[PDB]
RNA sequence: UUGACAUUGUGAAGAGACAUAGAGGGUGUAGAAUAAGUGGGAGCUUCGGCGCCAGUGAAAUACCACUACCUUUAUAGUUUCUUUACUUAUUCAACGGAGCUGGAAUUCAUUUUCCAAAGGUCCCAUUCGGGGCUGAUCCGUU
RNA sequence: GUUCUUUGUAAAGUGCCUUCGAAGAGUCGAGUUGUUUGGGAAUGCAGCUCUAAGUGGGUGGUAAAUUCCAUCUAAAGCUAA
RNA sequence: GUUUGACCUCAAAUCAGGUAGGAGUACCGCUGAACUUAAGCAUAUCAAUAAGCGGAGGAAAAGAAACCAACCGGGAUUGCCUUAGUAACGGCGAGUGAAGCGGCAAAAGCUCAUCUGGUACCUUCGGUGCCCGAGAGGG
């Protein structure tokens, strides 16, 4: 239930989320970064946890980021989808918390993550940004013109008692 | 067409919005030259104190022939042919009550102001009577016609609390056009009483004859 | 500032609505939960941070309930007593904060621990809803670490009735200069002069 | 709401800027609350009525979190 | 006891107004009538109309802004009040829809209501003994 | 007074260069109801209601334009004598 | 339609480890009288007294300025001194009653927004060995 002024909703079959959940893996995994030197290039950065993830945004740095749709309390994620539009950096929602933590390689859950730099996987990634665009494209007209309930099989059958008052006996 | 050009949400400075200057030039369309003005929103009373009148030289002219009949008496007259073109004595107030007025506008002296009273049922409609008040009697009646002619403008506020006059000519280069408008607002607000309340230039706007109209600050 | 600082101003606003559909929802859930509630997370984080609150063990967040309005004195039925001056019920109000209640309350109940702490965060009509930060003193966690170890001395004990914590503080007027203020030093401490 | 007119996110940006100026105004006599309500009502009561309504209320929300976060940050630069 | 405010949501309109855009008219002496009150002003268009001219007067009646007031429209509003409807926060007290088949009724028909542990299979066993499912029912505290 | 012994690194002074956050919201402030105070339109605190900005802000003993003066950054904390 | 292993939120148990409740005379935080005074009395006074309750320590409590200010300077906080029966309150009746400063006692400025537990090892306020859960910038 709720009321409600507009929250957060949409996008995530389970398709979408399990090759960017495997890109993520992949993306700490990849890891040599390596064992000499002073100056000694990357591959991986993985950053996790809501601090590090909207640091690294302001600072455009992260490649793609992916958010939990489950949070609880909402007002921790709520900055970033907003915040990166405006960094022009792509972002997935994933359903769970949990899923997220697992597979930054954390013990405990994750409220957001990030890739920072990829490793030579280049199209596959560009292929994620422009699925996650063809999910939600979107720019914000932000979205409840009030939602919330799914209206209870009594009240259902009130809707469909009222259409047919409209019909004949209103 | 005349519309696009404007912007009425946009409250330009004097040089951006021709008002007297550049883009208005553009928005008189007539084939004669016109006139630009100036008008004013002026809080300003009911009392006659906090009217506002008096009269601004243009360092520009108006750029308008105005042609003067004058009445004085004695050396006054004489003084008069230099800068006026239609000397008269105290005796010629019968030739224009009979029919003849030939003039934009009439300067009187002090002495004269007495046959002046006569003229003034006929002058005072059109607003051609001398009075003070628009500096048209001094003794110092030569400088006067000279500011006139020049294009000293006369500067009346209504009964509605508009106050109005013609600036110069659009044709007129923009340069000398935002002179023209400087001196005039100077004038207005200065003149402004004390009496008066909060924002004497209320609002400030300038046109064209045909046009339309852009907002000053 | 970083994160906490997008969290710290949803909490300026709240008839305002993102906030205010997190917590008209967490209003469902205040009403039925006692008055005591211990949580492991700050609803909180930007407030708490600067609250010292640190992840480190001994640590709590708990959350308290305390009622709202005035104040009612005993003894009804049997009205004093006195002249009209003293008289009152409803009249009178606590001086004490609803804020300073909270604390003693949760101090009370958690008598292993000392209240650093209070921040004040659902209103709803009939409940004022205080999130307390109570600390460990005796382990060596708390101990250890030199920007919390002031607690754990054996005269910051029951702090809160005491009045030490920045609540009790600024409930004394203390704060913090000169006229306003000159019999904060204590209410006492002026000593019928 | 959508237009106005006319100019667009110009014309939104002055009805905020205007918006400052009234709220300013508005505290520099204290009150706020009522005083925003008299400063609009002391003044033409069009544009301003609307854009105070709002103000009150909602108040844009998600978008006044968004302006002032980078309003802080580039007056923190 | 009684009204207001917080608690605090939904939207039907009846009635009141406030953006611009397009209309109309604008009740002081005389004046055919439309001189309300402002800048301006010699033309805008042509089969023309108004100034031109009538005629009076303080001032005359083209035309591009303007704008007091009577009134009324569009675009897409929004605003109070009701009431009056509606539930989702909330409070207090302490089942719903489908499925058979039965029976009543409509509609030519589509359509639309009223009502009311045994044995089977499987899995160990393949041996007694056991367990799972089924055993009229599928879906989603009052 | 005597005696043991690690590398260092980074901090810090002095001087050049731009620059600047760790700086705290139902708070600041308001009304209407209290009680307290020397506190008087101007003490402090409670309650109900409402409610900012973000280098902007608060103070300077009533309230309101300005430049600026003069001072200081709340809503956090500790602390010897 | 249906279950099983795993992720985190709430709950209950359990034993371990760790601490508190109570107390000592007064000192030391809140709620809160009256007779009495004004030759009555109702604001005021008694009095922010006594009491009651809560609770800490060897002192407690307060602390480095969103201070002071009425200038131009001071520069954390107590106390002492005196400011002063001054300002201020008040049937402006009775009464009530400061502060800034000046200078003393004594002085001090900082600090926020890998940790722990388990077992082993020792010279046991420690550290090593492992396992487990969780004021700022450039050269």
Redesign the pocket.
Same mark, same amino acid.
């Given at each position: 239930?709720?009321?409600?002024?507009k929250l957060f909703n949409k996008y995530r079959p389970e398709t979408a989320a399990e090759k960017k959940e495997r890109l993520t893996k992949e993306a700490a995994a990849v890891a040599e970064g390596k064992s000499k030197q002073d100056a000694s290039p990357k591959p991986y950065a993985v950053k996790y946890g809501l601090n590090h993830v909207v640091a690294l945004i302001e600072n455009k740095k992260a490649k793609l980021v992916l958010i939990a749709n489950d949070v609880?309390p909402i007002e921790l994620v709520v900055f970033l989808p907003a915040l990166c539009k405006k960094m022009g950096v792509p972002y997935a929602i994933v359903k769970?918390?949990?899923?997220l &933590?697992?597979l930054v390689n954390?013990?405990?859950?994750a409220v957001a993550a990030l890739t920072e730099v990829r490793a030579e996987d280049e199209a596959a990634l560009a292929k994620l940004v422009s699925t996650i665009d063809a999910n939600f494209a979107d720019k914000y007209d932000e979205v409840k013109?009030?939602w &919330?309930?799914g209206?209870? &099989?009594?009240?259902?059958?009130?809707k469909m008692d009222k259409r047919a008052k409209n019909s004949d006996s209103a | 067409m005349?519309?696009i050009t404007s912007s009425? +949400?946009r409250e330009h400075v004097k040089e951006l919005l021709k008002y007297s200057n550049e883009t208005k030039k553009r928005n008189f369309?007539?084939?004669?030259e016109?006139? +630009?003005?100036?008008?004013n929103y002026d809080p300003q009373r009911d009392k006659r104190f906090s009217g506002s009148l008096k009269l601004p030289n243009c360092p520009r002219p108006?750029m308008?022939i105005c042609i003067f009949g004058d009445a004085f008496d004695v050396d006054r007259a004489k003084s008069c042919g230099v800068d006026a073109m239609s000397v008269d004595d105290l005796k010629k107030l019968n030739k224009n009550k009979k029919l003849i007025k030939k003039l934009s506008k009439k300067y009187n002296a002090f002495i004269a102001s007495e046959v002046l009273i006569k003229q003034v049922?006929?002058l005072?409609?059109?607003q051609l009577s001398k009075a003070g008040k628009f500096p048209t009697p001094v003794s110092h009646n030569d400088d006067l016609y000279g500011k006139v002619t020049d294009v000293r403008?006369?500067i009346?506020?209504?009964?509605?609390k508009?106050?109005?006059? $013609?600036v110069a000519?659009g044709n007129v280069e923009m340069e000398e056009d935002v002179l023209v408008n400087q001196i005039l607002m100077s004038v207005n607000f200065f003149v402004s009483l004390l009496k008066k309340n909060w924002q004497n230039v209320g609002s400030l706007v300038?046109?064209?004859?045909?046009?339309? $109209?852009f907002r000053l600050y | 500032?970083?994160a906490?600082?997008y969290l710290?101003?949803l909490?300026?606003?709240?008839?305002?609505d993102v906030l205010?559909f997190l917590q008209?929802?967490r209003?469902?859930?205040?009403?039925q939960?006692?008055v005591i509630?211990?949580?492991?997370?700050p609803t909180?984080?930007?407030?708490?941070?600067? /609250?010292?609150?640190?992840?480190?063990?001994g640590f709590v967040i708990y959350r308290v309930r305390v009622?709202?309005?005035?104040?009612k004195?005993p003894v009804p039925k049997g009205a004093?007593?006195?002249?009209?001056?003293?008289?009152?019920v409803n009249?009178?109000?606590?001086?004490?904060? /609803?804020?300073?209640?909270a604390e003693?309350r949760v101090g009370?109940r958690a008598?292993?621990?000392r209240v /650093?702490?209070?921040?004040?965060?659902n209103? %709803?009509? @009939?409940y004022?809803y205080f999130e307390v930060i109570l600390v %460990?003193?005796?382990?060596?966690?708390?101990?250890? %670490?030199?920007?919390?170890?002031?607690?754990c001395?054996?005269?910051?004990?029951?702090?809160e009735?005491?009045? /030490?914590?920045?609540?009790?503080?600024?409930?004394?007027?203390?704060?913090?200069?000169?006229?306003?203020?000159?019999?904060?030093?204590?209410?006492?401490? @002026?000593?019928?002069? | 709401?959508?237009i106005?007119?006319?100019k667009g996110a110009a014309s939104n940006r002055t009805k905020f800027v205007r918006s400052?100026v009234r709220? *300013?105004?508005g505290?520099?006599?204290?009150?706020? !609350?009522? *005083?925003?309500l008299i400063r609009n009502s002391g003044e033409k !009561?069009?544009?301003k009525?609307?854009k105070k !309504?709002?103000?009150?209320?909602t108040?844009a929300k998600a978008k006044?979190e968004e302006?002032?976060n980078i *309003?802080?940050?580039?007056?923190?630069?």
């Open positions: 239930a709720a009321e409600t002024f609880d769970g918390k949990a899923r &933590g697992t954390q013990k405990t859950s013109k009030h &919330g309930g209206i209870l &099989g009594n009240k259902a059958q009130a | 005349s519309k009425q +949400v369309l007539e084939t004669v016109l006139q +630009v003005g100036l008008k108006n308008s049922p006929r005072l409609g059109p403008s006369t009346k506020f209504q009964l509605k508009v106050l109005c006059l $013609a000519v300038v046109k064209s004859s045909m046009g339309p $109209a | 500032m970083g906490y600082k710290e101003e909490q300026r606003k709240k008839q305002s205010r008209r929802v209003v469902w859930e205040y009403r939960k006692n509630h211990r949580a492991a997370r909180r984080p930007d407030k708490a941070r600067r /609250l010292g609150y640190k992840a480190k063990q009622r709202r309005g005035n104040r004195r004093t007593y006195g002249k009209p001056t003293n008289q009152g009249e009178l109000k606590y001086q004490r904060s /609803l804020r300073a209640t003693e009370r008598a292993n621990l /650093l702490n209070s921040y004040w965060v209103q %709803d009509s @009939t004022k %460990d003193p005796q382990h060596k966690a708390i101990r250890r %670490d030199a920007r919390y170890n002031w607690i001395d054996p005269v910051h004990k029951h702090r009735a005491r009045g /030490l914590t920045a609540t009790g503080k600024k409930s004394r007027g203390i704060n913090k200069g000169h006229k306003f203020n000159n019999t904060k030093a204590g209410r006492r401490k @002026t000593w019928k002069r | 709401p959508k106005s007119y006319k400052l709220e *300013i105004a505290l520099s006599p204290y009150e706020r !609350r009522l *005083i925003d !009561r069009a544009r009525v609307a !309504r709002l103000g009150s209320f108040r006044v302006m002032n *309003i802080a940050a580039s007056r923190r630069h």
